[PDB]
Design a protein around this ligand. Structure first.
Ligand code: B12
Ligand SMILES: C[C@H]1O[C@@H](n2cnc3c(N)ncnc32)[C@H](O)[C@@H]1O
Ligand SMILES: C[C@H]1O[C@@H](n2cnc3c(N)ncnc32)[C@H](O)[C@@H]1O
Ligand SMILES: C[C@H]1O[C@@H](n2cnc3c(N)ncnc32)[C@H](O)[C@@H]1O
Lengths: 453, 252, 453, 453
C-alpha cells in the first residue's frame, strides 16, 4: 500500500493508515482539537485519494487500536465472516464505495458483503462519500428489527418519545407522554433519561411509562437510560423491562471511562430474554456520537469518525433493536456549526446502516454551538430521506433537564406527511384505533393530549 | 406392448419437446434415480406412475419374505434367532429383535470360538434379498482376508429376526474384540438387495451407544460392490484393533 | 392438580403428568410399543380431559426428564421468558388451546405467549387438538427465517432438493439437481445425505452442489447431512459452507446416541458465522421425527409426541433456518399406517410452529409400513394448507439410497399451482429469469433438466 | 384392444372391459364384497396398465350394462356429442389422463372434450389417477351453477345446512338453522331429510325453512329430501319450492329399487319451472355414493366406482344445481377405513367434475366403520383444495336422526378462512349485511344463533 501521492505536482506523504483515515475527513473542530486533521484542503484531498486507493485488507489489518490491547478491536475482528472478507479483501476503498452505491448491488448483495467488513473499513468508505452519497447509500441499506414494533421497513419512520424531567416527576413525565402519543411519537421507544440512578426511582419511572402502555394497550416498549447495571437490577427486582440501554464507546479505555464491561452487555441480553416484555427478538438500545472517545482520552490518536464507526462494530455483535447517534449532543469543541453537524449526522447514519445495525439519529445541538433549530429541521429531513430508522421527540424539542434541543413531536408528523412515510405498522394500527391517525396523517383531533382523558 | 419391469421401461424418457434430447439420455444413464420422465402439467406422466406402482407392489413383497432355513444350512451357517418368533412380530417389536433368545445365548456359548479378535454375524434384518444375493460374493473374501496376514477369527453365524443392537450382546457373550454385522436394510422402491455393515469394538450392552459403531451402507451391485466391500471391512477391523475404538472414536 | 376424572360414571385415575400426556395421544403403534398408550378410547378421552384441565404451570413444573439429569430439559427450562410464563401459568391447557385457535389472537400475541411455554406444554396443546385444529392453528403461526432465500412467508411454499446417490456419484447428484431446479425445487436447500462420512468426499459433494449454484447464480444454499463434526471439519478446511445440519433428539441420552454434545451445535453456529456463504442470519438445519428417542432407549417412559416437542424446544435455542420432521422415515413400529402418519405430521408441524421454529416436513413412508404414495400426496397437501414451510423433492419421490419414498419434484409444483403459492421470493426471481416459472406456474419448457444445457 | 399384459415376466389375462375396470381400482371392501377386486397388488397394477392402454372407443363401446337393457346406459350414450367423441375416440386412457392434467389444457378445452365422454370412460381416467392427480385434475375443472346463489366459482366454497330432527320438530329444525347461518352455512341449500314422507309434514318443514328465509331475506333455497314424488305433490299443492331432490343410482334396476323413473325427473324439472322460487336456471339436487348399486343387487358385476360414475352421467342430463356423493354414508362393507373413504371422496368429486356436474361431497362416516371425525376433517380440506363445490353442515357434525357424522358448521368457516375462500357471492353479501362476515371471516359476533333474535 502507498502512503503517498502527488497532487498538482506536490508529494503528500502520510505516516500510517491512522493518519490517512483522519486527514481524509471533512473539516470538523474535533479533529483539529485532536490534532489529527488535514493541514490544507489539498492535503485533505490527497488523504482521500490515498485512502481511496488502499484495499479492504490494508484497512482491515490496521485497526486504529491493536487487537492485543483492546477488547472492542477483538470483538470487531472476531466477528468477521472470513469467506466474505476473502472475496473483497483486494478491493480498493474506491471500488467498495462504488459497489455500495451501484443500483446493480441489491440489499442481499450488501447483506453478505458487509459481514466481510470491519469498522475501520466502514469508516473509510464514508470518508470518500459526498453528502448525497451518504444519503443514497444509506437509503439502499435498510436494517429491520423488531421489539413490540417493527422498525426500519422502507416507507416507515419511527420516533423515540423522550419525556425527561428535572426531578423525574412522574406527572411531568406522564404529561409529555400523552402529548407525544397524540402526535404519533413513541413507536421506537418511550425512553426517559433519569436524574437519579437508583432502583426505586427507575422502577417508579418505569411503572409510570408502563401504566400508560398498559392502560391503552400501546404496542411499544419503555426504557430508562440509566447505567446498564442499575437497569438490570431494577428489572431483576421486578420493574417492567422493555429495552435495556447503554451508552457505548469505541474502545476498551472508553468503555472503562463509562464503567462498562462487555460482560454487562452479555448480561443485559440474558436478562432481557428472562424478563422483558418484548414480542420480537431485539431488546437492546445503544447511543453513540462523535467525540465521545476523544473526550475520554481514549481515541489513541484516531479521528472521531473512525472511533464512531467502531461503536457500530461493537453494537452489531449484540444485535440491538435500535442505535442512534446523538449527533450534536456534546458541544462545539467536537462539531462546531450546521455544516459539521449535518455532515456528522449523515456519516453516522450511513456507517451505522453499512454496519448492519438499526440506525437512527438524535438530530440535536447545544446552545453553546453555532447552531439553531433550523439546523435540526434540515438534518431530520435529510436523514428521513436516507431512511433513518428513527429520531427523537420532545415538546418543541426543548429538553428541560439535558439542556439541549432535539426534534419536536411536530417534526415526526411533518416528516411522515411530507414524505408519505408511515409509523411502525403495529403502532400505526394503534394510532388508527385511537383516532389519532388516518392514512398516515394526523386527524383533526390529533395533537391534543387531553384526547386520552 | 411393454413390461413395466423391463429395462426398456426403466430407461424411458418422457420429456416432450426437450431442449437437448441427447443430454437427457446422458442424464438418464448417470443415475438410478427416476429422472427425465417428464410431466403432465405438474403431475407425473402415466407410464412413470405405472412403473412406480409396479415397483411398489414388488417392493412390498420383499418385506415379508424369509431366507429359507435350507439356504442358511447350504452355507454351513449356524442359525440362532432373536426373541422374535415371526416376521410380522419382527416389524412391530424392535425391542425383541435386539435381544437373543435364551436358546440363542446357549447355542453361541456352546458352538462358537471364544474370545475372537473379529467376530462375523449375518442377519436378515429388514431384507432377505440383501443376504441371499450378496452372501457368496462378500463373505469368503472377508473370512479369508481376515485370516491372511491376520488373527483370531470367530465362528460366523446367522441370526434370524435380528436388529443392529443385538451385536452388543453377541460381543459380550463371545468376548469378541470386534463384532461385524452384515444386515439387510429396509427395502427401497426399485431394489431390495442393499446390505450394510455395522461394526463395533468391544461392545457392552450397558454402555455402548450407537455412535460407537462404524456403518458401511449400500453394499450391493448398484452401490459398493460386495467383493470391494469385504476389503474395506477387513481394513476397518484392523484399524479398530489398532486403535481400540470404533465409530466416532476412530481417528480421521 | 386433578389426576382423575369421571367419564360415564366410571373413575379414570392417572399416576402422574407423564402418563396423562401419554394416554391423551391419538392411538399409534409407537405408544403401544412403549407401553404408555391408553387402554381404550374411553381412557384416551379421559386423559385428554384431565390434560385439558391441567394448568401451564402443572405441565411446566413436571418435565418428563428432570432438570438436574438432562441438559435438554435445562436448555428448555432456562430459555423461558419468565414474565410471559407468569402471565399464563394459571391458564388451563384447554384455555391455551382456545387462545391459539382464536381469530382474536394475533401473530404478535403468540410471539410473546410462546416464550412462556416449555415443550411439554406445547405437546399438551397438540394432544387435545383435532386434525383441523392442528392445521388451522399452525397456519396462523407463521415462522419466517432467511439464509440466501426467505422461507415461511404466508403465501409461499419451499422445497428441499434431496439429490442422493448410492455411491455419492457426483454425476448422479448433479443429474438430480438439474431435474429438481427445473421443477422449481431447491429454495429451502440443496441437501445430500452422504454415503461416506469423510472430509474429502463431503468436499466433493459440496463442490458439486456449489458448482451448479455458482454457474447459474442461484439464490439458495447447499448442505451435506453427515454428522455435524465432519461438516465442521470440512468447512474449516475450505469446503463451501451453506447450511450446517444435525439430527437431534429430545433428551441428553438420545443426543449421546447420535454422538452429539450441545457444544457441537454452539460450535456449528460459530463456524457458520466465520465461514458460511449465507447472506441472512439463519444457517442451521435440524431434522427430527417421532420415535427417535424411544429407539435410543432415551424416552424415559414418555410418549413419542412429547419427546418430539422437546426436539423443537432444543432447536429453538439455535434459531435455525429450517427444521423438519421426517414423519414416517423409520418404520411401522412407531407409526403404523396412513392415519397415524398423517396425524403425526400435523402434530409435528403444529408443535414446531408453536415453538417458533421454521417448521417443514419430509412427508414420507417406508416399504414395510402400511402406506403408499397416495399417503404422501394426502399429507403434503394438508400440511401445505397448514402453511408448512417446506417439503422434500426427489425424482418421483424414490430415494435410491435411503430406501424410502418422499415427495416428487412434481408434488411441489402441484401444491404451489393448486393453492396459488409461490417459492421463496429470491428463488422465484431466479426461476423467472431462467424461464422455468411465470406467475407461480411452470412454463411450457419447465420440468426439463436439459434446459440447463 | 388387448386384455393382457406381461408384468415382471408374468402374463395377466383379463376377461372383459368390465373386469379390467374393476381390478384397476385401489383396494376397497365393496369390490371384495362384490367379488370384482384384483387378487394381488401386481394384478391391480396389470389392470391399470391394460386399462391405460385401452382407447376411449374401447370403453365407450363396452358400457357395464347394455344399451338395450338399461335406460341409464341409453341416456348416457344418447347424450354424447359425436363430433367431440370422434376427435378423442382413438386416444388411450393414458393419453386422456395426461390431457386432463396438462396445464396447456384450458377449461374451455375440457368443456368440449367432456361431451365426447361416457361415464365408463370418466371412471377409467379416475382409476389410473393418484390422489393428487384427482385433486389437481378436479381443481382445473370448475363447474358453476346458479339457483338463488351461485356455486362453483373458483375461490368460493359453499355448504348445505342440514338441520335434521328425529321427530321433524320444527323448533329443533329452526334452532339448527339459526346456528348454521351464524357460521355462514347455507349458501348451497337449507335441506332437511324428513322422518315422515307425507305432504302435510313436508309443507310444514318447508314452511319452517322459508319462514327463516323470508324473514331475513336470505339469498338461498330450501329443500326436503323426501322421495321426488311427494316433493312434487307438496309443491303442486302450494308448499314453497326451492330445490327438488332425488337419490339416484347408476342403473335402471337400481332406480327401480328406489322407485324412481326417469319420467319423474323430467316432471321435477317441469314442476320446478312452473312453481319454484329460483332466480337462476338450476333447481334440481341429487345425491349419490359408492356401493348403492351393489346394495340394490344392481351393479351387474361392475365395481362401485364405475357404477358411481354412471350416476354423474345420469345427473348431467338434468343439469342440476348441485350433486354430492355421501361418501361414507352406508358402512364399512363398501368403504372400510380412512384410506378408502378419502380415496372414494377424491374419486367421486373428480369424476363428477369431469362429467360437468356441480359436484360436492358429504364428507362423512358411520360409527360401525373404522373412521373418526379426524377423517372428515382430513377429507374436507383435501376436497376444498380440489375446488369441491360444497360440503354439509350440522352442529359439530352429529346427525341425530340419520345416525352418522358429517362435517360441523365450524368446518366450513375453517376451510374458508384457512384457504381464503368466500361463500357464494350473493350469500356473502347477506352475511356481511347481517354482521356475520367481514372479508371472508367470521366477525366476533358470529357463531351465535341468538344474533337473529
Ligand atoms: C433408519 C435410518 C436412521 C434412523 C435409525 C432409527 C431406527 N430405529 O431405525 C435414524 C433416523 C435415527 C437415523 C439416524 C442417523 N443416521 Co441413519 N440411516 C437409516 C437408514 C435409512 C436405514 C438403516 C437400516 O435400514 N438399518 C437396518 C435395520 C435392520 O436396523 P435397525 O436395528 O432397525 O436400525 C438401527 C440402524 O438403523 C442404526 N443406524 C441408523 N442410522 C445410523 C447411522 C450410523 C452412523 C450408525 C452407527 C447407525 C445407524 O440405528 C438403528 C438403531 O440401532 C440408513 C440408510 C440405509 N439405506 O441403510 C441411514 C444411515 C445408516 N444413517 C446415516 C447417518 C449419517 C445418520 C446420522 C449419524 C445422521 C446425523 N447427522 O447425525 C444419525 C445418527 C445415527 C446414530 N449414531 O444413532 C448414514 C450412515 C453414514 C455412515 N456410513 O456412517 C446412513 C447410511 C444414511 C445416510 N447416508 O445418511 N438413521
Ligand atoms: C448522556 C446521555 O446521552 C447519551 N449520549 C449523548 N451523546 C453521546 C455520545 N457522543 N456517545 C454516547 N452516548 C451519548 C448517553 O448514552 C446518555 O443517554
Ligand atoms: C437418517 C437421516 O434421516 C434423518 N432423520 C430421519 N428420521 C429422523 C428422526 N426421527 N429424528 C432425527 N432425524 C431423522 C436424519 O437426520 C438423517 O439425516
Ligand atoms: C338416504 C339419504 O341419504 C342419501 N344418500 C346417502 N348415501 C347415498 C348413496 N350411496 N347413494 C344415493 N343416495 C345416498 C339419500 O339420497 C337420502 O338422502
Amino acid at each position: 500500500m502507498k502512503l503517498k501521492t502527488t497532487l498538482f505536482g506536490n508529494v503528500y506523504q502520510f505516516k500510517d493508515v491512522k493518519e490517512v483515515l483522519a486527514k481524509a475527513n471533512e473539516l470538523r473542530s474535533g479533529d483539529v482539537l485532536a490534532g489529527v486533521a488535514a493541514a490544507s484542503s489539498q492535503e485533505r484531498v490527497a488523504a482521500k485519494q490515498v485512502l481511496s486507493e488502499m484495499t479492504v485488507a490494508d484497512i482491515r489489518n490496521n485497526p486504529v487500536i491493536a487487537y492485543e490491547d483492546d477488547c472492542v478491536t477483538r470483538l470487531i475482528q472476531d466477528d468477521v465472516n472470513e469467506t466474505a472478507y476473502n472475496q473483497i479483501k483486494n478491493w480498493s476503498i474506491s471500488e467498495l464505495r462504488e459497489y455500495v452505491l451501484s443500483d446493480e448491488t441489491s440489499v442481499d448483495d450488501i447483506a453478505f458483503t458487509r459481514k466481510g467488513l470491519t469498522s475501520e473499513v466502514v469508516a473509510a468508505v464514508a470518508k470518500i462519500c459526498s453528502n448525497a452519497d451518504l444519503i443514497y447509500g444509506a437509503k439502499k441499506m435498510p436494517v429491520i428489527k423488531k421489539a413490540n414494533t417493527t422498525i426500519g421497513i422502507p416507507g416507515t419512520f419511527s420516533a423515540r418519545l423522550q419525556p425527561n424531567d428535572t426531578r423525574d416527576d412522574v406527572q411531568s413525565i406522564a404529561a409529555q407522554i400523552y402529548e407525544g402519543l397524540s402526535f404519533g411519537v413513541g413507536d421506537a421507544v418511550i425512553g426517559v433519561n433519569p436524574v437519579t440512578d437508583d432502583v426505586e426511582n427507575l422502577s417508579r419511572v418505569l411503572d409510570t411509562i408502563y401504566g400508560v402502555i398498559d392502560k391503552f394497550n400501546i404496542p411499544t416498549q419503555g426504557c430508562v437510560l440509566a447505567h446498564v447495571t442499575t437497569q438490570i437490577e431494577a428489572i431483576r427486582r421486578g420493574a417492567p423491562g422493555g429495552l435495556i440501554f447503554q451508552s457505548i464507546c469505541g474502545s476498551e479505555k472508553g468503555l472503562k471511562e463509562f464503567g462498562v464491561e462487555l460482560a454487562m452487555l452479555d448480561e443485559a441480553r440474558a436478562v432481557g430474554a428472562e424478563f422483558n416484555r418484548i414480542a420480537g427478538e431485539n431488546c437492546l438500545y445503544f447511543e453513540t456520537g462523535q467525540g465521545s472517545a476523544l473526550s475520554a482520552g481514549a481515541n489513541f490518536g484516531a479521528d472521531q469518525v473512525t472511533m464512531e464507526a467502531r461503536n457500530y462494530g461493537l453494537a452489531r455483535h449484540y444485535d440491538p433493536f435500535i442505535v442512534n447517534t446523538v449527533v450534536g449532543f456534546i458541544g462545539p469543541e467536537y462539531l462546531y456549526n450546521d455544516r459539521q453537524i449535518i455532515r456528522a449526522g449523515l456519516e453516522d447514519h450511513f456507517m451505522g446502516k453499512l454496519s448492519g445495525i438499526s440506525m437512527g439519529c438524535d438530530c440535536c445541538y447545544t446552545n453553546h454551538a453555532d447552531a439553531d433549530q433550523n439546523l435540526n429541521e434540515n438534518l431530520m429531513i435529510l436523514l428521513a430521506t436516507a431512511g433513518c430508522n428513527y429520531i427523537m421527540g420532545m415538546p418543541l424539542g426543548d429538553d428541560i433537564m439535558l439542556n439541549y434541543q432535539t426534534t419536536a413531536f411536530h417534526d415526526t408528523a411533518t416528516v411522515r406527511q411530507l414524505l408519505n412515510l408511515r409509523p411502525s405498522p403495529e403502532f400505526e394500527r394503534w394510532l388508527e384505533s385511537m383516532g389519532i391517525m388516518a392514512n398516515g396523517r394526523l386527524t383533526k383531533r390529533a395533537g391534543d393530549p387531553s384526547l386520552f382523558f | 406392448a411393454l413390461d413395466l419391469g423391463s429395462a426398456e421401461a426403466k430407461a424411458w424418457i418422457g420429456v416432450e419437446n426437450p431442449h437437448r434430447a441427447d443430454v437427457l439420455t446422458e442424464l438418464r444413464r448417470s443415475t438410478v434415480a427416476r429422472v427425465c420422465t417428464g410431466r403432465a402439467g405438474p403431475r407425473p406422466r402415466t407410464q412413470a406412475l405405472l412403473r412406480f406402482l409396479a415397483d411398489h407392489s414388488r417392493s412390498k413383497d420383499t418385506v415379508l419374505k424369509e431366507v429359507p432355513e435350507e439356504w442358511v444350512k447350504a452355507q454351513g451357517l449356524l442359525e440362532v434367532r432373536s426373541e422374535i418368533s415371526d416376521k410380522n412380530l419382527y416389524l412391530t417389536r424392535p425391542d425383541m429383535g435386539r435381544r437373543l433368545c435364551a436358546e440363542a445365548v446357549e447355542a453361541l456359548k456352546a458352538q462358537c470360538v471364544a474370545n475372537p479378535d473379529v467376530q462375523v454375524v449375518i442377519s436378515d434384518g429388514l431384507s432377505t434379498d440383501a443376504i441371499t444375493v450378496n452372501y457368496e460374493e462378500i463373505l469368503p473374501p472377508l473370512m479369508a482376508g481376515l485370516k491372511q496376514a491376520g488373527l483370531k477369527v470367530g465362528t460366523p453365524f446367522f441370526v434370524r429376526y435380528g436388529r443392529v443392537k443385538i451385536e452388543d450382546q453377541i460381543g459380550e457373550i463371545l468376548g469378541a474384540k470386534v463384532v461385524i454385522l452384515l444386515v439387510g436394510e429396509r427395502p427401497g422402491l426399485g431394489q431390495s438387495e442393499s446390505l450394510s455393515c455395522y461394526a463395533v469394538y468391544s461392545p457392552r450392552m450397558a454402555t455402548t451407544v450407537e455412535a460407537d459403531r462404524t456403518c458401511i451402507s449400500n453394499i450391493h451391485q448398484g452401490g459398493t460392490p460386495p467383493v470391494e466391500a469385504a476389503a474395506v471391512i477387513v481394513d476397518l477391523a484392523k484399524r479398530m484393533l489398532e486403535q481400540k475404538a470404533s465409530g466416532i472414536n476412530m481417528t480421521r
